[PDB]
Each structure stands twice: as structure tokens, then as C-alpha cells.
A paper describes a structure:
Here we describe the antibody response induced by the [name]-[name]-2 Spike Ferritin Nanoparticle (SpFN) vaccine candidate adjuvanted with the Army Liposomal Formulation including QS21 (ALFQ) in non-human primates. By isolating and characterizing several monoclonal antibodies directed against the Spike Receptor Binding Domain (RBD), N-Terminal Domain (NTD), or the S2 Domain, we define the molecular recognition of vaccine-elicited cross-reactive monoclonal antibodies (mAbs) elicited by SpFN. In the case of SpFN-elicited RBD-targeting mAbs, we divided them into two broad epitope categories targeting either (i) the hACE2-binding site (Group A RBD mAbs, associated with class I), or (ii) a conserved cryptic site (Group B RBD mAbs, associated with class III/V). We structurally characterized the [name]-[name]-2 WA-1 RBD in complex with [name]-5021 and [name]-5001, which represent RBD competition Groups A and B, respectively.
To further our knowledge of this epitope, we determined the crystal structure of the [name]-5001 Fab in complex with [name]-[name]-2 RBD. The crystal structure of the [name]-5001-RBD complex was determined to a final resolution of 4.3 Å and refined to an Rwork/Rfree of ~0.25/0.30. [name]-5001 binds to a less typical, cryptic epitope, located on the “side” of the RBD, distal from the hACE2 binding site. Overall, the [name]-5001 epitope covers a total BSA of 1087.3 Å2 with heavy and light chains contributing 26.6% and 73.4% of total BSA, respectively. [name]-5001 recognition of [name]-[name]-2 RBD is primarily based on CDR H2, H3, and CDR L1-L3 loops. Structural superimposition of [name]-5001 with representative antibodies from previously defined classes indicated that the [name]-5001 epitope exists between the class III and class V epitopes. Further analysis revealed that the light chain of the [name]-5001 overlaps with S309 epitope, a class-III mAb, and the heavy chain epitope extends along the [name]-2057 epitope, confirming the epitope binning assays. Structural mapping of the variant mutations on the RBD demonstrated that none of the mutant residues in the Alpha, Beta, Gamma, Delta and Omicron BA.1 and BA.2 variants are within the epitope site of [name]-5001 mAb and therefore were not expected to impact the [name]-5001 binding and neutralization. Structure superimposition demonstrated that the epitope for [name]-5001 is occluded by the adjacent S protomers when the RBD is in the “down” conformation while more accessible when RBD is in the open conformation, indicating the cryptic nature of this epitope in line with other mAbs in class III or class V. This type of antibody exhibits low SHM  originating from the precursor germline genes in rhesus macaques, VH1-200*01 and VL3-36*01. Structural and sequence analysis revealed that the [name]-5001 epitope is highly conserved between [name]-[name]-2 and [name]-[name]-1 RBDs with >85% sequence identity.
Author numbering:
A (entry chain L): 1 to 9, 11 to 95, 95A, 95B, 95C, 96 to 106, 106A, 107 to 212
B (entry chain H): 1 to 52, 52A, 53 to 82, 82A, 82B, 82C, 83 to 100, 100A, ...
C (entry chain A): 333 to 530
Amino acid sequence: SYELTQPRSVSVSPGQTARITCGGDNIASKNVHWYQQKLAQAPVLVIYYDSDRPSGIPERFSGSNSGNTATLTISGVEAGDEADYYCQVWDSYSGHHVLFGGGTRLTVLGQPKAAPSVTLFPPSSEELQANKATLVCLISDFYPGAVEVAWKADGSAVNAGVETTKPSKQSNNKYAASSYLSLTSDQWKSHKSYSCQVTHEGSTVEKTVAPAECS
Amino acid sequence: QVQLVQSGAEVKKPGASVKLSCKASGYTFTSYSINWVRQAPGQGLEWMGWVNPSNGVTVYAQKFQGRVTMTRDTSTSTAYMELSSLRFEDTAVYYCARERDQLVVYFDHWGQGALVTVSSASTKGPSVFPLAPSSRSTSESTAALGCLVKDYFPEPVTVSWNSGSLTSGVHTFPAVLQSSGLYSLSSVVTVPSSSLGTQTYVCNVNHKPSNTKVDKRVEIKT
Amino acid sequence: TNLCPFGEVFNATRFASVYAWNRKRISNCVADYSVLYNSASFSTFKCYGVSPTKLNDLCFTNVYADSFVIRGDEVRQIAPGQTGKIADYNYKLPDDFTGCVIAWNSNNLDSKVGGNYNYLYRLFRKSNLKPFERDISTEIYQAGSTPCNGVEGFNCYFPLQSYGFQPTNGVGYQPYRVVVLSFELLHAPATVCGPGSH
Ligand SMILES: *[C@@H]1O[C@H](CO)[C@@H](O)[C@H](O)[C@H]1NC(C)=O
């Protein structure tokens, strides 16, 4: 069937003007509409009847449609607007179809370079009674991704039972991630002290915990 | 104005049937058709069909027809959509949306979407463990504590503190897929150390696909 | 500053079945209506309430373009107060239609050898269509008193029909592309204006 053509992703510096296109054979014949799906949430309508904004949508959103392309223009884009954008039309021509686009991953190369906030948590007593021991290393509010994380038992690099999530944005429009170290209840107490060491943009900070606390 | 409240993110085995609800608030229920759109993970949007609350007319897409059944209930102002003969590629987020215009199809409001995952069964509730504030958290003006959910089936899980009351200074992290194939995540909160003893902090965790609510009180281990 | 996109509505390569006619809302531009009737190629160009040549001196809050395809004999059903299969069950015009109806033969395009059965039209309905109403449902009609517990069967019929568009067809059954332009003035500032409104 007939289908809409959207770019993979468009990236702009903050305050620039982002433009997301939507391609279709004489796509001007039908009315297009644009929806913003923010990161990992319900989508919301930003543009309808190719130009109009719902009451509440900022005026920096503006649409157009002609020829074989409909264009969404976001002037003065900020990090908040960073989301996915989908253009949708009605095509009864192709057997009663509500056609969507492939989406586009708008990305802002944010100027802020945020140093991370890291908290380390030793395994709880209740978990120890469950014959488990997991150390939790929480990192948040860092703008560049923090590719370098590591665990050290007694100052020795250890990779036995290390899990780490892909960095992901938060409501701050900064990045957050977490790392879990798995251990048996024995090795947690046996080793002198464990430490979560995190580097980011060539800057290193580490947090150390020991089992002797309140034991 | 208008809200579309969906049902819980049910999770079932291949070949089964899953029925989702969507109730509308504020507006005259029968005035606007209700459409259903699903989203495969990390992929685009697929239109599934719509049903008219006024008369019960059901229109479906070519792909899903023969499996999908959309129904209406005006006495409750609620629509529902039923999908049978599930396969693995049906693992998706299903939203309900309001058809503002019948001649030019476009959607005003959206449901938050319910996550239906079709895998080889084995749904499990989470393991919940508390994280007491450290002695370097009690020395700080602001201490840090939180809850930890561990080894539940790949699912959606919700963590709210004091049943959605304490929100300032709370971060709920992305769920991580262990090599075991189970999800796990942590929910942390920074609270002033002056209120560690006076105020009691209890985190509520809810896992709909396994249908498990946990209320865990976070203490300070003496 | 950008003129209304009429060229991409007629010169569009794809048209919809009549029961599934497409409507586009035209707003916020200057429409040069002359280029329509300057293209003296249309088999049907009939205007109601408004003079075609003076349209270029007119302003509207909104314009609406409805595009579909029918067989040429059915073209005359595209008119106010008309009665027939298309008028009752596919696309109904009000008795006060202020706008133009344009149609032109597209046998060379929408008649594919061996048939182009993609273009459809509705055959029954429980009630005749209200003005500017579209129906694309596929519920199995119940002409029989007995309830239609059957998708197909005696007194339960599939309510859609296919136009057998073939290049050797009769002209009365040759495919024709149809555009209906309606002019709506609303209690809000006008958005589509003619070039001569100066
Ligand atoms: C498109 O419409 C007609 C018919 O397709 C064509 O002759 C003309 O060049 C284009 N411009 C107009 C009149 O909209």
C-alpha cells in the first residue's frame, strides 16, 4: 500500500530550527497531522490540518504541506522537545487505512556537560537472608553518556556479576544509569570492601562500601 | 477536558486472547469514535482500527482483521478491544485515541497505553529489598535511601512512594535485563536527615502482569 | 504567500473509491480558481451558488475538496437532491450546495486491462446518507427480517461492489475522477481567498 516516508533522525544544536519532513506521492492531496511521542510515554498531538496547533502547544511549532512533502518546523528547539515525531494521514484510497510515518528521532547536542551524581548501596540484610548479595550503583544527571563504569573488590578490578543499563535520559533531560554487582553472601563479607568506580569525560569518581557497617 | 484511562498491562502466552479497556471522561461518550493503535518496541505506530460508541460500528485494518474485536459500552462510557490468536510479534504497547474528525482522521487525546508482551509464559512478581540510609547519608544534610525490585519477568512495574505522594527527590531507574532474562530496577529518594526518624517512608510496588502489590517499609537498621 | 494546493489535488496520481471518498480542508492561502476552468478539459464543471469566474474575487473561512472516482453514468448523481445508488449510499449533497463539481474521464488511468477492481462502491445501507457523509463500514447487510448470523448467505449480503474498470468498457461505465469543492464561511476570519480580492 501507499506509505509515508520519514527520515531516521534529525539533530540540531539548541535554539536552532529543526525540520522534519514527511514524503508521499502528492501528499498535498490529503491532510497530514503531527504527533509528538516524548521518550517512553504516550504520544500527543502537536499539529493538525497541516498547520493548526492545539491550544497549549507552543508557537515555535509550525507545519506545512505541499507537493510531495509535509514539513514540521520547530524554531528555537530546546532539550525538552527532544522526542520522536510522527506524521499521520488518512488514506481511504488504500482500503481504509490510517497511515503513520516511520518516526524521526530529534536530538539536541546539549551544551551542558553535567558531572554525575553517584550513590552506592550495599546489599540489605533481608537480601543476605535470601542467600543473595547485590550492590547497587546509581548514577544520574550527567549530560554526556558515562561509558566507563567498574567495580573493585579490595582495590582490585572485578567483573564477576556486573550488569549495567544503557544510559537513558530522565525528566531532567540529563542522562541516568544504574549498575548491579552480584555476589554470594559469603564473598560480600569476605572481601575487605567493594567500590563502584565511574568515569565520565575523563573524570573519575568512586564510592566505597564495606560489610562491617551496622553488622 | 478529556482523558482516556486504559486497563492494566496484561501479559499472556502465545495463541491466547487479551482484552483491553479504555474509558473516556468529560465528553459525551458517543460523539467521537475510539481508535486503537499499537507500537512494537523501538518501532513505529500501527493503526489497528476503531469502533463508534454511538452505534457499535467496528472497522478494522487488513492485517488484524479476523483476530481483533472492538466493542462499546455506553452505560459505562467505555470501549474495549480484544485480540485473539496472539503471536510473538504482537508484543507491543496498545493505546486508545479519540477520533476528533470523522472525515479527516486525526487524534486529540491518547491513552497512556498498556504493554502486552507475548513470550513463553513464566510471568513472575518482583523481589523487593529495602536500601537503608548509609552512615555517610546520615552525616549529610540530605540522606539517600530507596527500594529495589529484583528478578521479575520482563514486564512493566510501577514504584510509587507513599502511594503516589512523595515525589520531590525521587528517581526510578530504567529496568535492566539481567543475563538471567529477568528485569530488575531501583527506586531512590533523597530526603533530609532531620526527618529520617520522624517520617516513615513506605514504597508501594505494583506489578500488573503478575498481579502483585508490595508495600515495603524502609527502615534505618540499628 | 503560498497559494492553495489545487494542482496536487487534481494532478494527484491516486484517487479513492466513492464510498471511501477523501476530504481535504483547504485554509490559509490564496486559491487561483481560474486555473481550474482555464483547464477546459473537464467533462463536468458545474457551479452552484457561486459564479466560477468571479470565484477569483471571493474569500472563504474554509474550502473543502472531496475526491473520488465513479462510472460516468453515475456522474449525474453528484448533484443536490439527486437520487440513486451513489447519492443514497455513497456521497450525498445538501439541497443548498454552494460550490462546484468537477469531473473528468480517467479511463486511460483507472481502467487496467483485465479490470481494475480496486475502486468500490456501497450497495446497501440501513438509512440513506446525510449530506457530506462517508460510510466505509463492512457489516453484512440484513435485507431479510431474520438476523444476519452469517457473514455471507441467503438474505445476508456483502454490502460493497467493485467497479470493473477495463479499457474496452462502455463510456457510461468508464472511470471518471470527481472533485467537489465546497465553500464554508464560518464565524471566524476568512482563510482562503481568490486572487482578485484586492
Ligand atoms: C492540476 O489540475 C488539472 C488537472 O489535473 C491540471 O490540468 C493542472 O495543470 C493542475 N492545476 C490545477 C488546475 O489545479
